Symmetry: C6
Subunit: 196 residues, 6 copies
């Protein structure tokens, strides 16, 4: 996973953001992207290969892994990162559009419409963070148990399947939840600081 | 997969495109290339290794995977990305050719023929996006089912084969479809904005 | 596969080539190198590991894969890329040699001998492209069939072996053939444009 | 694992730190990050794949690996690196915030509040290092024994499981402990040097 | 395999070498290093994993692979590349040492001792190339046959072992031999051009 | 393994070292780091996966590999590289500290204390090189034999285990020993050149 493109564009908008937005962005780079690439990706690497079911039924392990894990937590966190970063991109686009307009108009900072855009970007970041948190909760909760019982066809009756590294995965699930909540708190502080 | 070459050339044509073309390009980099490399590629990594068929027939799994998946979705999205990016390259080539001509002629922006070229590039992008969407639909639809039934020789009669990660794959199929449709809408907005 | 060295040297000779040579080079970077690294390499990744033969004979699968695939298509395309790029390197070497000579002589563009060299480079590119196309045809044709029948010792009598991903491989074989033919047409256009 | 982001930001704060802080940072880069990526990661690569248990019970190896290794040492060292680096980031943020304020105020080094912040950053680094050391001790100690006995369900009675590379892992555990303790000593020297 | 260090230093000595030395260096980068990383390394990737012997004897395949392939061709070509590049490094060191001396002496091109050093560097390159060619011949010849017969203990009597991809390996062996011989011819031309 | 950090810092101290220290550093980059990453790492890649023992005893192969190879040669060479490079870092730190002091004092080369530091750095490099050589000898000698006999529990009685690629490993062991000894000779020459 090469995050160079997103990185370069978000460090562009480091220069154009509040101090609390610079903290938010540093958190995104260090506690989410870096963790994902240096730790979480390896934890989930053998998610299906080490998933085992007590059965001689061909196909059962496939369908039971798929039912237990409709989308891997790591893919969900990738999507979360991209969607929470998208409003920053929108804002920096608006800002650069104004810089190029000012240059052109001459040929021919957080005030006015850039403030409304910044506040909206904060709002959307907050809502997307909340949405991904809630979705994670309803999909998986915040704990992976070792045992998963499966009755999906072709599995005969109910079969016992065993998850890879449930405890390490639980630790990283809770870590990512905490990081997301810190991000939410930072966004709240941004709104308060702007208001006051 | 190293997209550095294409990246550098398309960020060259960031400078020479409309604001809506800059949004289109950002979408290409973040929601297509980045997703493909940080998420989709890993989802499809074990596509054949975890594809299983209920048979003792040598060769059957090979032919049944090949019949179910004549071309992996990820390869199809790579091709789509390159073909939808090709008209941008043509346009930037025309533009740089005019810049070098102007420099030479001196030794010796979206107006005139560059406008016709830009509009044609938008048209071709739209048509290629539509073509890849339609091709995806006819080849696979927008859902991967866990079970695939196969009667290709050497398989005896009909055999039941089971796909790897059908649900996660379905999620990413729909995600990529939505991103492609957003790109189409952006191209339509480009044509409208130019007209008006 | 790291193509950085070749890339840097061929983007050096972007500056010193015709507009049609810049199109040829862009095609080389995007439709050949990029495809190879982002798509084809993964398609052929399990070429021998998923090659299966219906036999209990030790050694047979090894010799039958080797007879079916004396050289993988991807290695052949790597060689093709390097050989079709070599004349460009020769030409840019001649050109830079003249630039350094002019600088020296001062201490002490496509005209003259650089034109003869450019035309010769086009000729050699054309001949190498044709040669690799013809060699591909005679070695493999343009279709990989699922079944390969093998009688190489130690295989007893004739054994049935099954190829990995024959259809996807056929798609990429035809795609690379088309890209090579486009390159040929571009070289022809270069010669015509120079003549006229 | 790509540490480029963190690296660039910590080499930013090389310029703004004491000589002993530059030694601490060099130790972080060379003896922790570099060791982790060039050595430790490969030692732990086959941690679960080569973990074996003497049993015919489906699921037992999964639960026994998970009980023996709730979190891999390498993931724990990644977290440790990030948390001990976080206060440096806070300090450099404060410092750069003051530099940008001074620039602005003009439009309109370790003294004052930057000294309090630097001392606090040292304190937090020390406490986090101590906490990770203590946590490592209580979780695993400083030795990995080859044999792990496991009675977690579904394992019948007590089963004997065998760890991959216990001795090499013990060597690297002790090496990382020593490096952490050197870092602690460096922080103590920082506080003393500032006081005197 | 990261050749960045060697690359940067040899492109330093591009600037300080003859035109024929620039051709030699381009050949080294494109036809040896690039081939090795984009093609040969993958051909030899499954050298031991796909090496099979017709035996039920534990250990036999290990000892028979080791006897057949005391050193993989790819490792031998890596060593060859480094040793044939070493004299270039010596020469560029001498040249830069003279440049820094001239700068110093001021504070306080291929003529004289730099010519003797250049000629010696050519001589050593030639001798090392010849030595690696001869060593390759005596160790393996220039053909890998599919069958290798092995009588090394613990193998009982003589066992038949089968090599992975003998034909593709033979093609690349001959290709690398030809590239080495081209390098030799280039060195001879260097000596002649200097003499005349 | 990413050596970029160490590389950049050691090429910083290229500028501040003797000619013999520049040779030592080039040897470190080319004959140790580059060999390790382009050759040795692949030779040792299947060290445990291809290690086989003639036994039906669960756990025996694990404990016997661990007893035969308490620390892989490649990890030992990584540690050696870092420790022999550490004194260079100390010296360059002292030198840069003096450069920044001189700049400051103005606001307000190998002579004096920098000579003592340089000599001490040479001494420590020599001692660490000798120590790693001696440790290698006592741990493994300079030859890996194919057969390793093991009586570690749970292995019943004495079992015969077979090492992966003993001959290639022996070649690289001797190569690295020779490179280390060349480094020692270079350090001796440094001391002599400084004395005379």
């Amino acid at each position: 996973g090469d995050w160079s493109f997103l990185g370069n564009i978000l460090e562009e908008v480091n220069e154009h953001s509040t101090v609390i937005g610079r903290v938010w962005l540093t958190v995104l780079f260090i506690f989410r992207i870096l963790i994902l690439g240096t730790a979480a990706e390896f934890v989930w690497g053998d998610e299906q290969s080490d998933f085992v079911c007590n059965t001689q039924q061909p196909g059962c392990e496939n369908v039971c892994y798929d039912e237990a894990f409709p989308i891997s937590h790591i893919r969900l966190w990738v999507l979360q990162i991209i969607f929470v970063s998208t409003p920053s991109l929108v804002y920096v686009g608006h800002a650069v559009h104004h810089v190029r307009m000012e240059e052109k108009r001459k040929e021919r900072r957080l005030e006015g419409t850039l403030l409304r855009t910044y506040v909206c970007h904060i709002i959307f970041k907050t809502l997307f963070e909340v949405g991904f948190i809630v979705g994670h909760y309803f999909l998986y909760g915040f704990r992976i148990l070792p045992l998963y019982r499966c009755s999906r066809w072709p599995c005969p009756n109910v079969v016992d399947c065993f998850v890879s590294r449930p405890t390490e995965k639980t630790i990283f699930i809770l870590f990512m939840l905490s990081v997301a909540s810190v991000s939410l708190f930072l966004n709240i502080l941004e709104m308060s600081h702007l208001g006051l």
